[PDB]
Enzyme design. Structure first.
Site, short mmCIF file in Angstrom:
data_model
loop_
_atom_site.label_atom_id
_atom_site.label_comp_id
_atom_site.label_asym_id
_atom_site.label_seq_id
_atom_site.Cartn_x
_atom_site.Cartn_y
_atom_site.Cartn_z
CB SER D 147 11.73 40.42 62.91
OG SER D 147 12.10 40.13 64.25
CE1 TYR D 161 16.69 39.14 61.22
CE2 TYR D 161 15.38 40.12 62.95
CZ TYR D 161 15.53 39.16 61.99
OH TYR D 161 14.51 38.23 61.73
#
Lengths: 252, 252, 252, 252
Positions: D147, D161
């Site tokens: 990401s 995350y």
């Protein structure tokens, strides 16, 4: 003068240091106590070593306690923190310094090895942070000990250890955003080769590490403790979300 | 105690600080002189401001000289360095802190603008470093002031300034390798939004910058000076080739 | 199928490639022409080599022109660009691939050496970009060839070259912000050791480089050209401001 | 031509894609099958969605199977891999694309939340990699979907995350060293805001993300699939240990 020395001082601050029984952690717990912090340091089973660090800190004029808290057990960490708070009055500084080393050929690394490295290297810092975080206030400090292997991995065999430290750097940035509006800084210090039990300045394998170092030798635990102590005090107030590598130039 | 205060001290060191007349540079020249360094600071045309920084340093008990040296002129920089060495006895610490700000739409940026930003932001630090480097010995320090825009560019309009600072970080890694075997550390400090003439904590446009900051406010020149002073002294000995961002978390 | 092949295609695009006479630049100019781009490539004095690259591109069915433009001379670059536009119809892709290598002990590096490395490595890409940028439209591409030495400098002697490439990466981020709203992507590709005249897969000194490489050998100019060609086409549309390292893992 | 199309082709390669039932994973499984790979894709409970992706791949002329394998269960992953190998003939490409999103105020995040995010985001990729790795040979590919939050965390609430993805990038560098001498490349692709169920191009909260993007809009799953497909094939051979951000410039 005395104003700049107010600049250095931790008098009245309580610190909680994981891995305070040895190497980098013990050097940090001592330097923090030298600048005035009252220090709780944790250990898993090395009871005698941890007590002797407390004695050294007491002999030099400081205050410290050793608390047993297995980093694999979240409840044990949270209890240790509650105990620190009750015994020492509050909690102003958290230092995560209980990493374990791991190295092995990939073909010999199991899922249980991953689980074990992460439980202590990555999950135990998050547990301590999430629990310390109710107690910290404006002026609070979280400092994690990472590794220069978080940014640069020159060798095979060290994916788990490197990854656990890279995870901590990513956790650090996100926690800096979470805790910033409360006046708490959150940083990570990445030591390179530091003359310790985990990493003795005598080879085998010291040479491969030593060759990388721009200034030519392994550092010392005291080098890392001085950067931690600087971050922990008033002069670190505008540093947060940061990675600070202290590795003799290995990563240049 | 006094041993840790020996840890902080710069007594007997000579520092050369470019951009010492104002903002970050003046705060560094003062903090270095507070810890005992004799400081030569340079200025391009602000003669009065530079003299008043020398007076403040003298009043607090230190030693300093102001030398005129246009950063566009390599010979002027090298003369200033030779002068420092002759007047103050040697040269142990170099701080490059004379950057200029630049911002403009790309469609209004000329090749002469590039040339001008680089002559002062990028080339003038290399000139000072290459000349200081004959004089520095074991224990020497080179610290450059970069910008957090060296690592992360959130806005249009600032490509030249950002690039000049990214170039300095790349120059820093390579110089750490060059100067390491001689016992000299070479680092770069990247300030974020710091309340100065160049960057006033009052908007216009402060708000866009302020919004980024995890801890909620602009920092102060004194924050940057304290990290520089820590790197400049004995406790910085195992830090080299490093980028250290001090930006309140803007870059997290 | 044919839809994915529309995905790869550069038919109707005009490319301008600096350093197209040799190594990486020539491999890029050829791969871009293979996918359908009409290619203008520049050279400083190697007229014959540049013409032979044009002949190879013509023989394989493409269109190309060689234009003489000394990268030290901003006017020459801007003229070459104006010529490309007039002769080939417009300008859709700019690739900066004319870097020169430099290596020397710091004690033998002069200010004129800095000036010379930067004029070609750093300033000549900015000149080409600022001039190409009037001509590029929605769908335009700027790709710069950097070096993995922009991120990691393992050796002494290479501060100028490393810095010139780190500067380009910082310029790239800021230019991505400038040119983004116009639909132009701006990226930088960092090759590691690539078997060329500048860097022959035969040592001396190949071995030090080769040892670093995770996959065990030097790459080839064609490897770099394939990443450039992918970025240059429709599939690169959501990549911008990016650094892409293609170095066999040397930097891992 | 046809030689460059041999350049793009995956005919004869078997791919294993986790999270192949939806978003990025499904777009990757389809693009890999379009270039000729036979694709095994996994799902946890969305049986119908996974079958419909297999049908789309079959309709366009490819070969694919859907296998149920809960990413929380290491044995289930290893069985899925053994099954792929037996049914499709071998294993040449692994893509880890089964991440889950997590966001919450720190004060509402528990230790069980950490455990849950890591079991799927970080531990499940390591399990798949360690098991795929017996089967991969010279020419093998491991690609992980990370990401852009792995490198830059602009908001509070996303520490877990972000950290899980930063851990994967550090694991990637170390695995590139492990698997390099065998001719296997190991890379990580970091998508920015991509129009998916997990992240719809319609706000709420799209705007905060959209504002960051240099080229002005969310990307599409197909953008990520094209970079994965390029890395997976012959043209990715000199890229390994790399982080490749494809985020529209959000991170510039």
């Amino acid at each position: 003068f005395q104003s700049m020395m107010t600049s250095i001082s931790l008098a009245g601050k309580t610190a909680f240091v994981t891995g305070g029984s040895r190497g980098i952690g013990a050097a940090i717990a001592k330097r923090l106590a030298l600048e005035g912090a009252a220090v709780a340091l944790t250990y898993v089973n090395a009871a005698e070593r941890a007590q002797a660090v407390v004695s050294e800190i007491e002999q030099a004029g400081g205050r410290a306690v050793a608390i047993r808290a297995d980093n694999r057990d979240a409840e044990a960490i949270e209890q240790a923190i509650r105990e620190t708070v009750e015994a020492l009055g509050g909690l102003d500084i958290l230092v995560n310094s209980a990493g374990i080393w791991h190295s092995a050929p990939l073909e010999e690394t199991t899922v249980a090895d991953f689980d074990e490295v992460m439980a202590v290297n990555f999950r135990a810092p998050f547990v301590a942070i999430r629990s310390a975080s109710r107690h910290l206030g404006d002026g609070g400090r979280i400092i994690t000990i990472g590794s220069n292997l978080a940014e640069l991995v020159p060798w095979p065999g060290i994916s788990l250890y490197s990854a656990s430290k890279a995870a901590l750097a990513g956790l650090t940035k996100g926690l800096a955003r979470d805790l910033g509006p409360r006046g708490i800084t959150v940083n990570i210090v990445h030591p390179g080769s530091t003359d310790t039990d985990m990493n003795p300045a005598d080879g085998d394998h010291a040479e491969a590490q030593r060759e990388r170092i721009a200034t030519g030798s392994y550092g010392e635990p005291q080098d890392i403790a001085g950067l931690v102590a600087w971050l922990a005090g008033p002069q670190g107030k505008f540093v947060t979300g940061a990675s600070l590598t202290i590795d003799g130039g290995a990563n240049a």
